[PDB]
Each structure stands twice: as C-alpha cells, then as structure tokens.
C-alpha cells in the first residue's frame, strides 16, 4: 500500500553557496571555480507526507 | 586558517596553537641612495635612506 504520486518539478531561490576554501575575504570580490548550484534552476520535488 | 586582504594577498594568520590572529609585516622596505656633489670637488659622500 504505497501509493507513489508521480514526481514534480519545482525551482529554486539561490542554493548551494559555500565557501571555496579556507581563506578569509574582506571587502574584496573574488571569483572560484568549484560545483555549485546554477540559480533559478529546476529541480525534483518529493513528498513524504 | 588564513587571511588575505583585497590586494589578494595573505596579510593576517591564525595561530594554531593559541588561537591569535597575528598581522606579517616584512622588514623589507627602502634602499640605500649616495649623494656626491662632486669629484674633483671633494671626497665627502652622503648616505640617503627611503
């Protein structure tokens, strides 16, 4: 008796930003290379409910 | 751990043993500059720091 609903697609508001490394940054703006999140990206919703 | 300023270069440290944040500052600043007002003058030379 699992009902599984089919799954949804849903968007995001800004997620996935973290710090490149272990370097403190003030009042400079530096530009890394890492695998972050694109913005206003589609994603996958599951329920659980 | 570290510390860089805008000029993108490490300016402060973190100490790892007792927690400290230490500025580096080398002693590397200036030169050494001779004044001479002439040869056939005299042979009184002149030391200029920067």
């Known amino acids: 008796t699992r009902t599984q609903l089919p799954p949804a697609y849903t968007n995001s508001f800004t997620r996935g930003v973290y710090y490149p490394d272990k370097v403190f940054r003030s009042s400079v703006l530096h530009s890394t290379q890492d695998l972050f999140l694109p913005f206003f990206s589609n994603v996958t919703w599951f329920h659980a409910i | ?50």
């Open chain 2, 1 to 50: 751990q570290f510390g860089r300023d805008i000029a993108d270069t490490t300016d402060a440290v973190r100490d790892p043993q007792t927690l400290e944040i230490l500025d580096i500052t080398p002693c590397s600043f200036g030169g050494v500059s001779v004044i001479t007002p002439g040869t056939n003058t005299s042979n009184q030379v002149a030391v200029l720091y920067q």
